[PDB]
Amino acid sequence: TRRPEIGDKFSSRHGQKGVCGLIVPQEDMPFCDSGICPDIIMNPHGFPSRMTVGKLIELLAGKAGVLDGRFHYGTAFGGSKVKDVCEDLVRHGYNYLGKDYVTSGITGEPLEAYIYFGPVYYQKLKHMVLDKMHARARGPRAVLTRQPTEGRSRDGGLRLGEMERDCLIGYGASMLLLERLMISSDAFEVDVCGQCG
Amino acid sequence: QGRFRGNLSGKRVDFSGRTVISPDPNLRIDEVAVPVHVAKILTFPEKVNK
Amino acid sequence: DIVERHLIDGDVVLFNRQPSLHKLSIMAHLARVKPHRTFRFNECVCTPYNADFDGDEMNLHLPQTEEAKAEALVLMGTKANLVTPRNGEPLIAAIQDFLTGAYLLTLKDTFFDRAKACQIIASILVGKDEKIKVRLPPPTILKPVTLWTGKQIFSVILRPSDDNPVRANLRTKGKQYCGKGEDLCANDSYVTIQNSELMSGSMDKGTLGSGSKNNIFYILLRDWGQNEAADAMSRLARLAPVYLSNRGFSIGIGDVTPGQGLLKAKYELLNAGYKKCDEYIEALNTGKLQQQPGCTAEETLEALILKELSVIRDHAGSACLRELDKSNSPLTMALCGSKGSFINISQM
Amino acid sequence: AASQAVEEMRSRVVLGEFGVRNVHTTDFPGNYSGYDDAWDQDRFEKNFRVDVVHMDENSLEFDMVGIDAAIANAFRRILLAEVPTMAVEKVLVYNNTSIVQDEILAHRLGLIPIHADPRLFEYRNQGDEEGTEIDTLQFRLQVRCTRNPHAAKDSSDPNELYVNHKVYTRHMTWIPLGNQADLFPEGTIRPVHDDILIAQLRPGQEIDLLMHCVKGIGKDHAKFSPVATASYRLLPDITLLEPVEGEAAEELSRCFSPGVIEVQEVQGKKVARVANPRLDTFSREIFRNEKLKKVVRLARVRDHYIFSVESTGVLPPDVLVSEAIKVLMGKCRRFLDELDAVQ
Amino acid sequence: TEFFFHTMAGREGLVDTAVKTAETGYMQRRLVKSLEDLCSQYDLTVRSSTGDIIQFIYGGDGLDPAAMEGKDEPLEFKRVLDNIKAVFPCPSEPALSKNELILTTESIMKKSEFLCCQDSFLQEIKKFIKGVSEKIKKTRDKYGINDNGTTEPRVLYQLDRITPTQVEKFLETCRDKYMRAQMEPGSAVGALCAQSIGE
Amino acid sequence: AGILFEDIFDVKDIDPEGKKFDRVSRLHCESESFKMDLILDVNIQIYPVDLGDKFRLVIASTLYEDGTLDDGEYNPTDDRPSRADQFEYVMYGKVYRIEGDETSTEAATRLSAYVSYGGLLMRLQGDANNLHGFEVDSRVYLLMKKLA
Amino acid sequence: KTALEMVQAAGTDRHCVTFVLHEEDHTLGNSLRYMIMKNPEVEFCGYTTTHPSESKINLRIQTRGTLPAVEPFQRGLNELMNVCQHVLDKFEASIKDYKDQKA
Amino acid sequence: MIIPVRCFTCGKIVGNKWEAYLGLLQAEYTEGDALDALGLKRYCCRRMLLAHVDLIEKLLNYAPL
Amino acid sequence: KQAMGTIGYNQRNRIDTLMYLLAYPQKPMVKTKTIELIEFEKLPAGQNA
RNA sequence: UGCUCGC
Numbered sequence A: 001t002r003r004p005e006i007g008d009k010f011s012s013r014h015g016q017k018g019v020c021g022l023i024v025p026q027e028d029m030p031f032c033d034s035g036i037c038p039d040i041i042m043n044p045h046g047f048p049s050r051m052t053v054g055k056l057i058e059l060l061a062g063k064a065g066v067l068d069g070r071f072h073y074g075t076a077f078g079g080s081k082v083k084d085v086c087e088d089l090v091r092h093g094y095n096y097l098g099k100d101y102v103t104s105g106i107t108g109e110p111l112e113a114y115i116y117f118g119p120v121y122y123q124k125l126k127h128m129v130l131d132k133m134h135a136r137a138r139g140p141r142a143v144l145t146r147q148p149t150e151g152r153s154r155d156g157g158l159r160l161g162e163m164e165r166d167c168l169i170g171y172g173a174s175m176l177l178l179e180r181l182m183i184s185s186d187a188f189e190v191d192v193c194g195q196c197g
Numbered sequence B: 001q002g003r004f005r006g007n008l009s010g011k012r013v014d015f016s017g018r019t020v021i022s023p024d025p026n027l028r029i030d031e032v033a034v035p036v037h038v039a040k041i042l043t044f045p046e047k048v049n050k
Numbered sequence C: 001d002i003v004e005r006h007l008i009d010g011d012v013v014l015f016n017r018q019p020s021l022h023k024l025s026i027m028a029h030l031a032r033v034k035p036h037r038t039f040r041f042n043e044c045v046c047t048p049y050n051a052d053f054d055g056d057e058m059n060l061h062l063p064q065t066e067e068a069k070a071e072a073l074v075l076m077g078t079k080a081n082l083v084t085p086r087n088g089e090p091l092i093a094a095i096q097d098f099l100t101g102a103y104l105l106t107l108k109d110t111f112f113d114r115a116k117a118c119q120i121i122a123s124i125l126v127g128k129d130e131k132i133k134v135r136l137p138p139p140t141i142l143k144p145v146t147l148w149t150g151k152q153i154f155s156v157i158l159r160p161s162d163d164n165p166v167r168a169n170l171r172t173k174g175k176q177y178c179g180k181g182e183d184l185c186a187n188d189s190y191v192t193i194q195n196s197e198l199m200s201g202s203m204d205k206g207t208l209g210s211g212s213k214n215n216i217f218y219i220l221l222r223d224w225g226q227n228e229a230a231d232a233m234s235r236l237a238r239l240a241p242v243y244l245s246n247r248g249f250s251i252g253i254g255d256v257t258p259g260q261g262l263l264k265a266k267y268e269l270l271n272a273g274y275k276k277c278d279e280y281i282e283a284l285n286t287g288k289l290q291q292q293p294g295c296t297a298e299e300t301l302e303a304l305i306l307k308e309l310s311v312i313r314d315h316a317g318s319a320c321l322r323e324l325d326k327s328n329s330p331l332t333m334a335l336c337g338s339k340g341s342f343i344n345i346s347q348m
Numbered sequence D: 001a002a003s004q005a006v007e008e009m010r011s012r013v014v015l016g017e018f019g020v021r022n023v024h025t026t027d028f029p030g031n032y033s034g035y036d037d038a039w040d041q042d043r044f045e046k047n048f049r050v051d052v053v054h055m056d057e058n059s060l061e062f063d064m065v066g067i068d069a070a071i072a073n074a075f076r077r078i079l080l081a082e083v084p085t086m087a088v089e090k091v092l093v094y095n096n097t098s099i100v101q102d103e104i105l106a107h108r109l110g111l112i113p114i115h116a117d118p119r120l121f122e123y124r125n126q127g128d129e130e131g132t133e134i135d136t137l138q139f140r141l142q143v144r145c146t147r148n149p150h151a152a153k154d155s156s157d158p159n160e161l162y163v164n165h166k167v168y169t170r171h172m173t174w175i176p177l178g179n180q181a182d183l184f185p186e187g188t189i190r191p192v193h194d195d196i197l198i199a200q201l202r203p204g205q206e207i208d209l210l211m212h213c214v215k216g217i218g219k220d221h222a223k224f225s226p227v228a229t230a231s232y233r234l235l236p237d238i239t240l241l242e243p244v245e246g247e248a249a250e251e252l253s254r255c256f257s258p259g260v261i262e263v264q265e266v267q268g269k270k271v272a273r274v275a276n277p278r279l280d281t282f283s284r285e286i287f288r289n290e291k292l293k294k295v296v297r298l299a300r301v302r303d304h305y306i307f308s309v310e311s312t313g314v315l316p317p318d319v320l321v322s323e324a325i326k327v328l329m330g331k332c333r334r335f336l337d338e339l340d341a342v343q
Numbered sequence E: 001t002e003f004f005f006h007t008m009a010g011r012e013g014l015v016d017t018a019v020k021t022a023e024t025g026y027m028q029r030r031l032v033k034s035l036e037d038l039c040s041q042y043d044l045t046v047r048s049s050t051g052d053i054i055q056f057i058y059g060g061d062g063l064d065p066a067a068m069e070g071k072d073e074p075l076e077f078k079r080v081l082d083n084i085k086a087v088f089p090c091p092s093e094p095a096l097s098k099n100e101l102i103l104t105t106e107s108i109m110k111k112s113e114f115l116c117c118q119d120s121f122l123q124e125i126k127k128f129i130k131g132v133s134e135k136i137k138k139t140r141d142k143y144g145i146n147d148n149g150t151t152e153p154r155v156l157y158q159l160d161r162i163t164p165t166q167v168e169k170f171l172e173t174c175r176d177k178y179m180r181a182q183m184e185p186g187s188a189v190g191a192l193c194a195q196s197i198g199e
Numbered sequence F: 001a002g003i004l005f006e007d008i009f010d011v012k013d014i015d016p017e018g019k020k021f022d023r024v025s026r027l028h029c030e031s032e033s034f035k036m037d038l039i040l041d042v043n044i045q046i047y048p049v050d051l052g053d054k055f056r057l058v059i060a061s062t063l064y065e066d067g068t069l070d071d072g073e074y075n076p077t078d079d080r081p082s083r084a085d086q087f088e089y090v091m092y093g094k095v096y097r098i099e100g101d102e103t104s105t106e107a108a109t110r111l112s113a114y115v116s117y118g119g120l121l122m123r124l125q126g127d128a129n130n131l132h133g134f135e136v137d138s139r140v141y142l143l144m145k146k147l148a
Numbered sequence G: 001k002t003a004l005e006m007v008q009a010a011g012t013d014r015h016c017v018t019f020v021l022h023e024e025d026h027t028l029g030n031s032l033r034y035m036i037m038k039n040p041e042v043e044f045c046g047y048t049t050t051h052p053s054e055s056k057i058n059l060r061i062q063t064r065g066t067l068p069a070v071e072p073f074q075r076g077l078n079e080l081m082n083v084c085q086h087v088l089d090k091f092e093a094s095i096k097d098y099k100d101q102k103a
Numbered sequence H: 001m002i003i004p005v006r007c008f009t010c011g012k013i014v015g016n017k018w019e020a021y022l023g024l025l026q027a028e029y030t031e032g033d034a035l036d037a038l039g040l041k042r043y044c045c046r047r048m049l050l051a052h053v054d055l056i057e058k059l060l061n062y063a064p065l
Numbered sequence I: 001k002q003a004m005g006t007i008g009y010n011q012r013n014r015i016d017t018l019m020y021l022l023a024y025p026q027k028p029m030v031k032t033k034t035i036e037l038i039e040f041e042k043l044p045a046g047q048n049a
Numbered sequence J: 001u002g003c004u005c006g007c
């Protein structure tokens, strides 16, 4: 039984994949006049570059629906129009654009700009930080080449690829490259004859 | 996957970890946050001196 | 004796993203242990790693040699690799939610009282900045009301304490600069800073971003060393989010809705473009059409139709930009250059 | 004039079409020239007042006049997180054959509020999982679902076919420890709502468990939060710049809340006026009408906060506000004692 | 139809990026494998692993591309002069004329520490000094400023105000920046070039 | 007296390029005694102005009329007889630019002082004789009082 | 071990002091900031959070003259305590008269 | 699977108002009027009760029993 | 295609090498007609927040 | 070895 934490990947049914960056308490969350605190706070900067107006339309339709007890339709090339959900919002006493007067929870003072609140259908993805967390000690090595194994289920270590070697060369760190690729990976002591080679 | 490209030029090493990243502005640009779990696994050999 | 100690604070540690395009894809940082389970770092270093925090997995290596540790800290130090070797442009700079926050902070509309200004200034007094004096700047307006402008609060980041020898000076043009004001632009888009004090202009990607030269952090790096630039970036990353959260910045469906004049202009432009395209079609199909040089008649018609459609597009975009009111979150983020542009706004 | 603008900035918070202005608290010494905003206990005790407008079970609404946004937010946050209560923490399970998962069952049991008075208990020390009479409570839940011996031939509804198929929280039985039976009369220690559906069972399945509840604050976990919704809002004060009459006045009654703007026929013509600005929620629908934008001025009173506190039923909300103020006083006293010990 | 066309364009962009990833990966691999041998020696000559010289001096001048402040230029003399004037404003020293500025520049440049500097940078410094001296002369001719220092409106001296202290600071700063912007011996210039071309 | 400049100005335009900012406006003003043009950013929210307003403006080195230039730090709480008592709108800024007029190619006698009151721009242009005492990197006080 | 004082530098200057408060949050920080900002002898008052993971806050006080900046701290604490006592008494009296007039 | 006891956003007790809501669905009440009669003013509890799917009985149909 | 949620009514008796289930799945408020056609609302894979 | 994924 797992609880959402830092590192869990979340989707918002619009290709806006995200990772939980911080878990703030309830009192730190901003609150409206009715006292509702948001569960998920998403960055607005993701909207202009991606032009996800459909997300805003879905939010508005969902807010109107949860206000009037209906299920609006987001059918392709159709569905409920913006005018209908705006009328549903203005009828219930809320703003016709979703933006509501919100007071900051931290300072206790109202915000200079209204906040876009609304119910969004967020879906959690199978990509978890707990399953993806990996750390490699000395551990086991392969029989053929005495190097760490490949995968995490095999208790493997991370590989310094060719491009990483190129970057280390460009930096000029000869000792670090030597320690990584020789000392810490496949160091060995052989016996060579100086006569025959 | 040959010896030169898979075992000589680029090979696997230990004392390393892989984890998903998350933002944290309260840290300096030259600092990185490491989980306690990975920190207990990745060890550093320190020589005893005076 | 050798003691295999746990990873503690201060250890130099390599941090890398497996897709490596340039050398800045892997850097040596200082490890700080946290109770969570993710690799956390300052978002200003996101541009070198080309990360976007949408599930990217990054690698973290621990050197097992003092010589390797020292070489990593010196050669691959984050403060020592603030600029790419390709063209010298700074990559580690302000990013989204830092360009917009600083832009809204340095706007001429900002006027803070003593309490809010003191709070915003103290928001950065953590870590090594706990052993310095605040040096509260004198207020601009004092007789009617004592108000501190946002530009002074931003300049406090450059020179926090009295003993700080940082004297930043810069004179450049912004993104929305008219071209004739010469530090007197109506939009106030001429950046001018004297003695680490923002005298005129508003911060944007052209001055705080990782685009090219004339960056304030680049000037600090080239004039006063790496440590001062790193401290300024840390103060910015600790100050801008606090003010951005205390002020509030949101986008709604009403921020992208078209106006009545915009709809009328779009209708007229579509009608005119369709009429001209029909005229061109009739001229090519029935009769002789003026053939452009270097191409056939069909390619000439294609070019003319593309020109008419682009005319419609750009005129509708200009009409939408003119009819849009200020404080619009898409327009605000497009002006500062943090994310998006006028083309995306016109399309959406 | 300038004085009117200064007073509006220092007393009112204006809500514009695109953004809100005058949101920062500025009544501080040195910010204003013609005003001595230095702290005065006498003026504060004179101007401050509390007026309760509505008070029923698990619901309170009261207006505070003279307090600031900082202290109001502090009270709200203390009520939300720093008020300690009793909630289920430990779950000992004996042969849980239910379809509902054991961890999910424990999580659902933890969210169930307890009517026990938290002031009569203490915080459990670090460790000590066995628990003592002072700092724990035990609730036994043993439900065995079986087929009804007497039912109809069809019995399509599960109610007639099976008995105890829905394990409500009323099946929880408080088991006294030590002398808790004598201190607490029968019926006091019990679930709050008594109708919460914990799980649903089938014949053959059985749910047997014991629940150890200890004192805790809402900051540690949301299950200790006594208040369901504890918030505060600035008191609106809608003002008319020019007298609005005629049919457009009716539009005002349709632009704002139905209960704030009232139309009256003083001379046979309808004229609108503000009746009760409290009921308005500031939907900002007056900005849609082009003509009626420059005739009204929406504003919020800075030093007038209407607090609405809806609790979960653990204790009446007035005692909750009292305990929040007591917790703030205790924090202040602890810090004063620490400072005195330092010096 | 518009949605279908937009999806077509998006898929075209996606396949373009998919091909570009592998193509540039192979190109970067080849470029780095070819260029990884070069290194900047201590005699300012770039030589290969076998000892053969590729360049007698890197880039013809020997400056670090990472420390290139201007547009393929080591310093922006205008910004440096403005910074020197702003950081060290000397109010107790009189302004300099064109002849005095040229004289003090020629006197400072002929010192020993400026001999090891490259001739092109010194010529650029002389050109910038001559340009700013011509600007000061034009300003003083427009506003009738006398070089004796006895003009009644002293604010006229604030138009183009320069003091020998600021001149020395500017020259020393330019010399230090040019010295610290040169190629540090031992740097893997070939790998840096390969990466800066492949990225 | 530390009065560097003092003159009565009349406003000729409020916003020649439109209502850019809600709180700040770019007033253009002309003096009566001399031909001193003034382009000044003012805060209309706390100090409203009109098109036909006429106001006296004084740029002083110090805020104390006795000549004490001790301005290491300003304490708003301190109460003492100062120059700001005789004016209504007081700003604190620094003269950050002194630029000669480039329109007149020869025999030019006009200068311009650019002062930044925390980003609020003030260009005072006119005869160099009136601008005596203005120096770069010098912090001054602006005092504006509307007249009848 | 809860509230600890820190001088501005090694010189041990009493004008600029930093109080580090443990197991606290924005509530008490903002309340004390508001209660001590009204003190005319305080030039700069400001509270901040080091990191959301750990529960600690840092307040910084810089006075005007030669105040040790510890006396304004105790002054603000006592003023906040008095305000809390007054609002508690007023709320109790209000609830009592409401209960009396309701029946 | 089953109706949650606490609301995600606010925290109002909503698990005890599920079956009665079903009764309001067994009666002639619609969604909106039933949610209003149940005492859910804020839209968060309305979304909690309306968007909830009762999957516990479908699982009990597959229970061992 | 990687969304977490319920699989079917027999997800408890089903034993697979890896299964992800949601504690309190909720049907979307803005549902397409395709959702009603494929009966996705009977087996949601997300929550409305 | 195969394949589905994660950027």
Ligand SMILES: Nc1nc2c(ncn2[C@@H]2O[C@H](COP(=O)(O)OP(=O)(O)OP(=O)(O)O)[C@@H](O)[C@H]2O)c(=O)[nH]1
Pocket: J001
């Ligand atoms: N068909 C099939 N071939 C496999 C499998 N695993 C490995 N191979 C073949 O073996 C080669 C790779 O061998 P490895 O995966 O290194 O074998 P390994 O994991 O070292 O084997 P162990 O030492 O037993 O763990 C490939 O070329 C495959 O053709 C498998 O599961 N199925």
Ligand SMILES: Nc1ncnc2c1ncn2[C@@H]1O[C@H](COP(=O)(O)OP(=O)(O)OP(=O)(O)O)C[C@H]1O
Pocket: A050, C019, C050, E021, J007
């Ligand atoms: N095949 C690959 N090779 C190298 N890097 C990859 C590959 N696939 C994904 N990545 C990583 O993911 C990043 C690609 O993201 P990018 O293409 O810039 O945005 P995007 O996926 O188009 O998102 P939008 O569709 O714009 O929202 C950059 C790269 O480091």
Ligand SMILES: [Mg+2]
Pocket: C051, C052, C053, C054, C055, C056, J007
């Ligand atoms: Mg990514």
Ligand SMILES: [Zn+2]
Pocket: A193, A194, A195, A196, A197
């Ligand atoms: Zn041999």
Ligand SMILES: [Zn+2]
Pocket: H007, H008, H009, H010, H011, H012, H042, H044, H045, H046, H048
């Ligand atoms: Zn709710």
